[PDB]
Amino acid sequence: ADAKALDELRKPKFSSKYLIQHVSQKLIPAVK
Amino acid sequence: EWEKSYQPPVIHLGRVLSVGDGIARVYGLKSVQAGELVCFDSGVKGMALNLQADHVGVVVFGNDSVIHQG
Amino acid sequence: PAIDAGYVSQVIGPVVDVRFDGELPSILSSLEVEGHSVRLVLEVAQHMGDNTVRCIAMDSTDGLVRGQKVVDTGSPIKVPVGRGTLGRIMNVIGEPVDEQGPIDAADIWSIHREAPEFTEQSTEQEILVTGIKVVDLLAPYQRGGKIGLFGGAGVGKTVLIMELINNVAKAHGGFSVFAGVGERTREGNDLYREMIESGVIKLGAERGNSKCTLVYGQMNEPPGARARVALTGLTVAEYFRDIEGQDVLLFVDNIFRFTQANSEVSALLGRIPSAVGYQPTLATDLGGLQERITTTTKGSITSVQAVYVPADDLTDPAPATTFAHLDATTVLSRSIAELGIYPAVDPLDSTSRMLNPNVIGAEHYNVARGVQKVLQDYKNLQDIIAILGMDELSEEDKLTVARARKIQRFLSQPFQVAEVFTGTPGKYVDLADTISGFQGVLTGKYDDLPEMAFYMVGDIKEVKEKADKMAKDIASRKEADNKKVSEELKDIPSLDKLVSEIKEVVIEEDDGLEEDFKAEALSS
Amino acid sequence: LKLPTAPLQLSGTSAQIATLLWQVAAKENQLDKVQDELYQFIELFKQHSELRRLATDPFVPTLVRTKIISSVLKDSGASEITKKLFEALADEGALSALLEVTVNYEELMLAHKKEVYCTVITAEPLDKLERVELTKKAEKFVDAGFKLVMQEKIDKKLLGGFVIEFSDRRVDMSTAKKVEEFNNFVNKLVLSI
Ligand SMILES: Nc1ncnc2c1ncn2[C@@H]1O[C@H](COP(=O)(O)OP(=O)(O)O)[C@@H](O)[C@H]1O
Numbered sequence: 001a002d003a004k005a006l007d008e009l010r011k012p013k014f015s016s017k018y019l020i021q022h023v024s025q026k027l028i029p030a031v032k
Numbered sequence: 033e034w035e036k037s038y039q040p041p042v043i044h045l046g047r048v049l050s051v052g053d054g055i056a057r058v059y060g061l062k063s064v065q066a067g068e069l070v071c072f073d074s075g076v077k078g079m080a081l082n083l084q085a086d087h088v089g090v091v092v093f094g095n096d097s098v099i100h101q102g
Numbered sequence: 103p104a105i106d107a108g109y110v111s112q113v114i115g116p117v118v119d120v121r122f123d124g125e126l127p128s129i130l131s132s133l134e135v136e137g138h139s140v141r142l143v144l145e146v147a148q149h150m151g152d153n154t155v156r157c158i159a160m161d162s163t164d165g166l167v168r169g170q171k172v173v174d175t176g177s178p179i180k181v182p183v184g185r186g187t188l189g190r191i192m193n194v195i196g197e198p199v200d201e202q203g204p205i206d207a208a209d210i211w212s213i214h215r216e217a218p219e220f221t222e223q224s225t226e227q228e229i230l231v232t233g234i235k236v237v238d239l240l241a242p243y244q245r246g247g248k249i250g251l252f253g254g255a256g257v258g259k260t261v262l263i264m265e266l267i268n269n270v271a272k273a274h275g276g277f278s279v280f281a282g283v284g285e286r287t288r289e290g291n292d293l294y295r296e297m298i299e300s301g302v303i304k305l306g307a308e309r310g311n312s313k314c315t316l317v318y319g320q321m322n323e324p325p326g327a328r329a330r331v332a333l334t335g336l337t338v339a340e341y342f343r344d345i346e347g348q349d350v351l352l353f354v355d356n357i358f359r360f361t362q363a364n365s366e367v368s369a370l371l372g373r374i375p376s377a378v379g380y381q382p383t384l385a386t387d388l389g390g391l392q393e394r395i396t397t398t399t400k401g402s403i404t405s406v407q408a409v410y411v412p413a414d415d416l417t418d419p420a421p422a423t424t425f426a427h428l429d430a431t432t433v434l435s436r437s438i439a440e441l442g443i444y445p446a447v448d449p450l451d452s453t454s455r456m457l458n459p460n461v462i463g464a465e466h467y468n469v470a471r472g473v474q475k476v477l478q479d480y481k482n483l484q485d486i487i488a489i490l491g492m493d494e495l496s497e498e499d500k501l502t503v504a505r506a507r508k509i510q511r512f513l514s515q516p517f518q519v520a521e522v523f524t525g526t527p528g529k530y531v532d533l534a535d536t537i538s539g540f541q542g543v544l545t546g547k548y549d550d551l552p553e554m555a556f557y558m559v560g561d562i563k564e565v566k567e568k569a570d571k572m573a574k575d576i577a578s579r580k581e582a583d584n585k586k587v588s589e590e591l592k593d594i595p596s597l598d599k600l601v602s603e604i605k606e607v608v609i610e611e612d613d614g615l616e617e618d619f620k621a622e623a624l625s626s
Numbered sequence: 627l628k629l630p631t632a633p634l635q636l637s638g639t640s641a642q643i644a645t646l647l648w649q650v651a652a653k654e655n656q657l658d659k660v661q662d663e664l665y666q667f668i669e670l671f672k673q674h675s676e677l678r679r680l681a682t683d684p685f686v687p688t689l690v691r692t693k694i695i696s697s698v699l700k701d702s703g704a705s706e707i708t709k710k711l712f713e714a715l716a717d718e719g720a721l722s723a724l725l726e727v728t729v730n731y732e733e734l735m736l737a738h739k740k741e742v743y744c745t746v747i748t749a750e751p752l753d754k755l756e757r758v759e760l761t762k763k764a765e766k767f768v769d770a771g772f773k774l775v776m777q778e779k780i781d782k783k784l785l786g787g788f789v790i791e792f793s794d795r796r797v798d799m800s801t802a803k804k805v806e807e808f809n810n811f812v813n814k815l816v817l818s819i
């Protein structure tokens with residue numbers, strides 16, 4: 001993997017959020 | 033006749049990954065031949081020695097001080 | 103063309119990784135690179151593990167791109183074998199390199215096979231008379247056995263192997279195979295040209311009466327070709343042994359260059375190196391090759407192979423491994439050659455399994471062991487002679503110093519292939535002439551002869567002729583030398599007559615290099 | 627077994643994951659579905675420090691790492707592929723390989739959308755005709771009927787014309803290279819005559 005293809009992943013590219021929001025009621029109860 | 037037969041050829045690029053101990057490692061250059069003479073942007077020539085899956089080992093015909101990563 | 107065709111993954115010198123999308127080729131199978139400057143043949147060495155095979159190229163990899171399609175031939179390297187390959191020169195992959203057309207294929211055999219089994223081995227020891235005094239006496243060659251000629255960097259193991267070609271092969275009857283492995287191309291062009299003068303190789307229409315196949319993998323070739331041309335040379339010789347069923351001679355010049363070529367490839371095949379820098383699989387690479395060169399019950403291969411020693415070291419692992427595989431060993435020394443003794447055979451390092459009193463006879467064996475005892479006793483005296491001198495030994499010691507200095511010179515011999523740079527004519531010494539010739543020196547029949555009468559002669563009659571000639575040349579002396587050179591009536595012209603006979607050459611106006619460069623290029 | 631062949635072949639062990647991730651998602655026709663879920667996970671590693679602790683910290687046990695990832699993906703409507711993917715990387719501790727898996731997943735999608743990203747640097751902003759004219763000659767440079775997207779840049783050091791930057795090759799068909807390719811040609815020839 002190169003760097004110019006990997007440095008453009010710091011910008012958000014998801015444009016859909018059925019996972020990024022569907023863990024708040026799942027992540028912090030699981031790590032606790 | 034030079035201008036009626038004139039196409040500026042497509043220049044294949046490659047980044048330097050790593051340089052030092054006399055050999056640069058070069059990202060890219062996908063169609064480079066084994067043993068090909070490559071030219072760095074500092075003017076210094078090199079020879080495409082080891083074609084690898086992910087880089088090209090280039091031995092540098094000159095001082096490796098003028099080559100940087102990138 | 104999707105499947106059964108892979109593409110180049112990576113090129114590391116002569117080692118190419120090829121990636122196949124399905125049904126990888128077998129190990130030792132040969133692949134073909136599409137669209138190269140020459141025919142580039144790879145041979146699969148390893149299965150690397152992610153649908154990648156690792157191959158060794160039989161030609162140069164300069165000009166290879168990491169996408170080039172590689173097709174599988176579904177078989178190993180297969181060379182033409184038969185009587186249609188006699189008189190031809192082949193390379194590692196079986197192509198003709200003598201410009202005499204395509205090679206007539208009695209069969210197309212793979213260069214890789216297993217060694218013949220234990221039940222097919224032969225146990226038969228008959229002597230091979232060579233005409234060389236030091237070989238027939240102290241380490242006689244077996245007719246049907248493996249012979250090795252050890253020595254390094256100009257001791258004469260190619261001049262010795264040409265003499266065995268001259269002496270043994272012309273009076274042999276069967277076919278020869280010469281496998282040039284990693285040697286000079288000048289030296290292989292010399293052999294091809296003198297085998298046409300000798301009628302061993304006949305060209306054109308009478309080609310089937312040729313009695314030698316040449317297979318050349320010389321020292322300009324990349325290490326993939328040199329690591330495999332000794333196997334092409336056997337496959338020609340194994341065909342005449344197994345199928346034609348006859349006695350053949352296999353001369354392999356520098357079978358060390360098979361070992362060295364595998365050691366260049368193995369640095370790039372990703373291996374931990376062995377002792378002094380060689381590949382870990384040295385003994386089995388060499389052993390898997392040498393075990394094919396045998397006499398079986400169906401045919402015989404009398405192999406003579408030169409073995410280079412690196413930096414004149416016999417404990418180096420590539421010479422030391424080759425010693426076990428040979429029936430007769432002929433170690434050539436540099437310290438003997440600098441004395442002018444040629445062939446420079448170390449008589450206290452050359453061994454044969456034929457030096458056995460049940461095999462060569464009782465009196466041949468006793469002369470041979472008697473000569474080695476005089477030479478060993480003189481070797482034990484070398485340090486005290488060096489610092490104290492000749493005048494301090496016993497009379498019993500300085501009797502054997504003078505006898506061993508006589509048999510040291512008498513083991514030397516003019517070769518018929520050395521006449522071109524020495525001038526002395528060669529001498530084929532018969533086996534009976536060297537046993538009774540060396541039997542006389544041990545008893546003391548020739549203590550009164552000088553030492554230099556033994557140097558560069560054929561047999562014991564010629565030390566008596568050379569001593570008479572040596573004594574006479576310090577006796578023949580003439581008064582006023584019989585010139586008759588001045589006052590020669592009408593033969594010697596003047597200078598200005600002779601200068602006028604010189605056809606004066608013309609000078610073509612200062613090198614002319616522009617008209618014959620600008621004629622053809624128009625590009626830079 | 628019988629997987630669809632990948633659009634272009636790639637590097638080792640992080641592109642091999644994404645090539646297998648691509649071939650599974652093409653056998654199941656979820657090539658944009660799991661691509662977006664990959665992008666959703668990159669942002670999800672950015673929001674939380676307790677989620678990148680399961681990818682960098684060497685003291686998080688293997689049992690804690692494989693139970694937590696399965697716990698937050700037992701629900702949430704993710705693919706069957708990416709649920710099996712993330713428990714595979716969490717068993718082996720290769721969750722940090724996700725960020726390099728997905729950039730090899732991108733260029734597999736790019737060579738399947740039939741697409742090439744480029745950068746055209748010109749002297750002045752283009753016309754409704756200059757844009758169609760160089761695009762008609764830029765099909766000669768891509769090795770297919772690929773869809774060059776665009777990108778428009780401006781520099782006045784070029785004397786009209788354009789250059790292309792294809793991210794691995796460039797074509798300098800500007801006039802400013804044409805005048806020094808003229809001058810070094812005419813100076814090369816008059817020292818020959
Ligand atoms: N029998 C011999 N008589 C005279 N000179 C020899 C003899 N054998 C070798 N030499 C000398 O040694 C040199 C090198 O021999 P060569 O056969 O080339 O050895 P190698 O193949 O080991 O390099 C020859 O050029 C020759 O001058």
Ligand SMILES: [Mg+2]
Binds near residue numbers: 259260285
């Ligand atoms: Mg030699």
